[PDB]
Design goal:
Chain lengths: 105, 148
């Protein structure tokens, strides 16, 4: 049975740093954990898979190589993303009373 | 050519400037497409400029309809009933913005040859010339060679 399609929208959690450092302790601990180099494939996979499973948002293959440090992972997971349609975006962009937008799609 | 084209006289819809200026444009219908390279500029205009234009011109109702289209269009309806349809097909955002602003600033009168660059409803203040202006009057109104 195919699971229902997942929404691509993702709002970063408020306790993002705490969750990330907990996962870092689980995977790898030392001071300045933000600079822990993700050069080991095993540890990189463990951390990224745990984060993806927890947050419902995974690092795309394009950015996977540039996620070189825990700081980079934190930046990627704190930048938000939205999946609303263009119609929804235009309608929610505070249209003035004299502007009407409709789709025949 | 002028002889092969209709012509009119310079005029305003309702003496548009005497009491108060009224924007003649009233409706702007943008037929755009979600897909299609022709309406890429129209899509960008709808995204970035149409809202600003709408709030700048509160007297104009703008209807943006996104439906499958090969030639995106803008239909401008003016107060006088004139309807002008323009193609925004393969036009950049700047070109579409200039076209829309021109439509907003343009009246609904037909874009045809204008016979005179001016129009006065009171051309004369001192009295239009007639042959008897600048002609002296004679005693008892006697025409030339009249005996009595």
């Amino acid at each position: 049975v195919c699971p229902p399609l997942r929404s691509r929208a993702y709002t970063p959690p408020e306790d993002l740093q705490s969750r990330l450092e907990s996962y870092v302790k689980e995977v790898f601990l030392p001071s300045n954990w933000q600079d822990i180099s993700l050069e080991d494939s095993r540890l990189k996979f463990n951390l990224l898979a745990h984060l993806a499973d927890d947050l419902g948002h995974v690092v795309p293959n394009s950015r996977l190589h540039q996620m070189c440090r825990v700081r980079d992972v934190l930046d990627f997971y704190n930048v938000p993303i939205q999946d609303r349609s263009k119609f929804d975006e235009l309608s929610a962009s505070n249209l003035p009373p004299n502007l009407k937008i409709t789709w025949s799609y | 050519t002028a002889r092969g084209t209709p012509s009119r006289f310079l005029a305003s819809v309702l003496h548009n400037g005497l009491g108060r200026y009224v924007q003649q444009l009233q409706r702007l219908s943008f037929s755009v497409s979600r897909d299609g390279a022709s309406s890429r500029g129209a899509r960008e205009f709808v995204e970035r400029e149409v809202i600003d234009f709408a709030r700048r011109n509160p007297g104009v109702v703008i209807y943006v309809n996104s439906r499958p289209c090969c030639v995106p269009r803008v239909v401008a309806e003016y107060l006088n009933g004139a309807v002008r349809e323009e193609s925004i097909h393969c036009k950049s955002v700047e070109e579409i913005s200039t076209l829309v602003q021109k439509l907003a600033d343009q009246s609904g009168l037909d874009v045809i040859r204008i016979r005179k660059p001016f129009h006065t409803d009171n051309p004369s203040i001192q009295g239009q010339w007639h042959p008897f202006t600048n002609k002296p009057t004679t005693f008892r109104g006697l025409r030339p060679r009249e005996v009595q």
